[PDB]
Subunit: 526 residues, 2 copies
């Protein structure tokens, strides 16, 4: 008959959507995999069962009891990784090492929060800061506290990280006692739904704590109320429709947005072709263009290098990109797989054609035949490297994101009265980004330059020879560090270790006699 | 023909608006005071000059340098308090003691931030937390930092606090290196304009750091950009119109909202009439209904008391309210002045008539003759106290805010089994999120436990008991070291809370680097 129709888990029950559903397909082979549908679901019940039953059940447990359930989920996901790697190969067309960024990235992030959470103790509220006297005699004092929000957390997640986007958000939400409703992007929804089905089947979390809807998003935001939270990852276009909905404009629900981000990499003036730091730069650029076919939100899109260094840069990138083979990830000779879908492949080819009108194409290996795949079926795109000689006057470099294995290089004028001042200005023209990386032989220089980029980048990632062996990667998101960025990148904050708990809590100043603050404090932790 | 037209301070210059202007009047005597106008101002240039010239100039300074300028503002405003009190009496109609909540509250807050900022030192960015290893051998690490946003701070401020609304917001903004543009509510804008004019005239801050526009708001939000921040204080319905603007929905500018808040006071089951907690509760309710004629955002609007205590509570409130004399604040016999205007007078009276459709009016001193004021001219409203016998089935109680010397009392059911106030907690939460709830008991430990039950729906929980009768800082008084704001109906905003306030004006970033580069 037809491929499997994945059920939704809502109000404590597995429920199928009506109709024919939307088919997910293998972006390499064109094979139909599974279908999704949310048609006819009772969204009022889905949200009320989560918010009431789900939230009460979670709030009755302490942080440490919730953290122990996260640890149990870690052991479950780890035991089923073989099933996960099989879905990733078919649904996303990624190499095994690239599938690991999503699978094992998600599982590592969940484990981090399970360990952090065990330290929060057997309490139901947390202390923010210490107590402060409000009187000369200290008879009357103030203590701030954090309490779980009496709402649900709705995650609208991007197609690139069906696993990591689930767990990076769900770990702090569930540790904070807040029930989760996840809505993965349709094209790659399968891994998200299987991971949720696995956890729900195991009965680790209370009923109502974890729900999933796949298919149309129609009607979800209409269920959002003032004590709920929403975390959206997607396009800047979509983000502006979302922001205008009454849930936020009239009802004031908290919202996090992650959106388009034209991340930068800056080769410092001292890192000339003869020094160790030059090759670190070449290597990282090619890495971020090619991991998942450049489908990380954090991937380098703009690379800025001294005028003098432009030729040697273009030559070194050409030579490294040449080693990147493209095709079917089932073949071990393949270095880089497909984009997530043929639809995205069209977006990316359109993006390349619009950039070509203002830039020169320095590298493009599109004529090379794919390994074990047909270019007229598969969503494979070859790396493309553009050159923009006049970035001050460029119309498209700083504005148009191409969500593929594509990047533009541009020279900057060395300031030799920071030497990297013009590069700092150019990175800013991206109007606000998740991350910038910076490359130098000089560790002390990196500190100064980093502060110059800090007010327009959520993370600044500095690479130099003393950390060639230890630096954690431009595009890789360590969960103990902030993830998000200002401006175009959306104005959002996630992760950052303990920092992530605040989005899910309500903060309150308690002002009382000192013995009352003492008793409050006995019921809390930090 | 014609009172003084106050000028705007924009793009480092004083510029009058065109046209006739809108007259500000004394809400007791009806005297014309000053005029305001923003008509024909070049807003693109006002915003650009603050953003570019102002921001660059403030970021050039360290946190300690900026805090030193704040200390110099403190000394200036203190020397000018005589002028400020005279403006407050005429434009706002408040007694000397209630004026002081705005004037001396502002100065106190600004001075708190001046002292806090001196401790931040000779640096241009702040560390958020400590450094953390990202590698087995610790050669690679991370440190989060806070850096001033490269924007402007636009404050749209409510009529009730023309001084404190300016300085509570401006103090952390300017300490954080962010230029300020203030838009005070028209009816009481004079004191804000005069404070800004004194500061500007003194040359304490760089040109572009401090700007003011008084008059129509048209076109202001159109100038807001993605790195700017906006703090709005006003009605829920105006907040919702504002949230839909492109500045936020498309450009993503940060926004804080303070709006309607039906703040609660809960009398605990142990606080019976023969105990000292009982009188503390009676006094606090009276003070919150009457200071500034009930025009604090944080005033008690709902008071919840055990069924057994309902009659003694009504009788004791009547007795205290009857001592509250009303009229011209110029008369030292007057305990309570006017509302800010004759328009607010009408709004409050319509609110009173609306509540009375569902509640019994238990106390009303409307017929008592005013002292040195004409009821047909002045904006004096007497205290009104309502009783709602069935708060579980009441509508209006929990939904309709009367911004005047008006409150409602309602009984709750004491729970006898293994908190006694469980029902009062539920009733507080029906206000859909508030700035503040206060709680009253003889038992300090009990107040600790109860406070945690209200914390998820109130930005501040304020406990009053005999051991702090002399030291408790008041239900409605905002201490700048403590969080101000609340969830849900109250707006979802956060301000103050000492150093916590700085974060709204900064961008946070994780820096990951060689351990030498780090910290």
């Amino acid at each position: 008959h037809m491929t499997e129709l994945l059920k939704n888990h809502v109000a404590g029950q597995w429920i199928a959507g009506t109709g024919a559903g939307i088919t997910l397909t293998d972006p390499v082979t064109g094979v139909a995999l599974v279908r999704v549908s949310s048609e006819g679901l009772d969204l009022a019940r889905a949200f009320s069962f989560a918010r009431e039953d789900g939230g009460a059940a979670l709030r009755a447990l302490t942080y440490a009891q919730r953290a122990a359930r996260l640890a149990d989920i870690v052991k479950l996901l780890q035991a089923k990784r073989g099933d996960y790697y099989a879905i990733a190969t078919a649904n996303s067309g990624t190499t095994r090492n690239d599938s690991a960024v999503d699978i094992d990235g998600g599982i590592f992030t969940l484990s981090y929060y399970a360990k952090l959470g065990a330290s929060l103790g057997e309490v139901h509220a947390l202390r923010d800061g210490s107590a402060e006297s409000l009187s000369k005699d200290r008879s009357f004092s103030a203590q701030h506290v954090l309490s779980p929000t009496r709402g649900v957390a709705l995650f609208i997640n991007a197609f690139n990280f069906p696993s990591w986007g689930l767990w990076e958000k769900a770990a702090p939400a569930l540790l904070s006692g807040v029930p989760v409703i996840v809505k993965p992007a349709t094209a790659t929804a399968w891994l998200t739904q299987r991971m949720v089905a696995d956890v729900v089947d195991a009965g680790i979390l209370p009923p109502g704590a974890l729900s999933i809807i796949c298919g149309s998003s129609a009607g979800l935001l209409d269920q959002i109320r003032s004590f709920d939270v929403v975390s959206f990852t997607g396009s800047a276009d979509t983000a502006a429709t979302l922001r205008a909905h009454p849930a936020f404009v009239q009802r004031g629900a908290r919202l996090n947005v992650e959106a388009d981000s034209l991340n930068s990499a800056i080769l410092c003036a001292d890192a000339t072709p003869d020094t160790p730091a030059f090759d670190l730069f070449i290597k990282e650029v090619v890495r971020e263009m090619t991991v998942k076919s450049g489908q990380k939100c954090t991937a380098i899109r703009r690379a800025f290098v001294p005028e003098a260094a432009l030729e040697p840069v273009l030559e070194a990138l050409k030579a490294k990109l040449a080693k990147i083979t493209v095709g079917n990830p089932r073949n071990d000779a393949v270095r880089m797989g497909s984009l997530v879908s043929r639809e995205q492949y069209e977006n990316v080819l359109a993006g390349i054609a619009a950039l070509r009108e203002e830039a020169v194409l320095a590298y493009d290996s599109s004529a090379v035949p794919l390994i074990d795949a047909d270019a007229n079926i598969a969503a494979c795109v070859a790396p493309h490297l553009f050159v923009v000689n006049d970035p001050d006057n460029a119309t498209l470099l700083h504005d148009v994101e191409v969500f593929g294995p594509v990047a533009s290089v541009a020279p900057y004028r060395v300031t030799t009265d920071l030497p990297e001042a013009h590069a700092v200005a150019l990175a800013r023209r991206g109007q606000g980004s998740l991350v910038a990386s910076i490359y130098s032989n000089d560790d002390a220089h990196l500190g100064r330059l980093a502060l110059e980029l800090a007010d327009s980048h959520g993370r600044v990632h500095a690479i130099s020879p003393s950390v060639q062996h230890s630096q954690t990667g431009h595009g890789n998101v360590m969960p103990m560090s902030l993830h998000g960025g200002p401006g175009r990148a959306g104005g959002g904050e996630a992760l950052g270790g303990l920092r992530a708990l605040a989005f899910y809590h309500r903060r309150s100043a308690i002002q009382a006699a000192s013995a009352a603050i003492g008793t409050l404090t006995q019921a809390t932790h930090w």
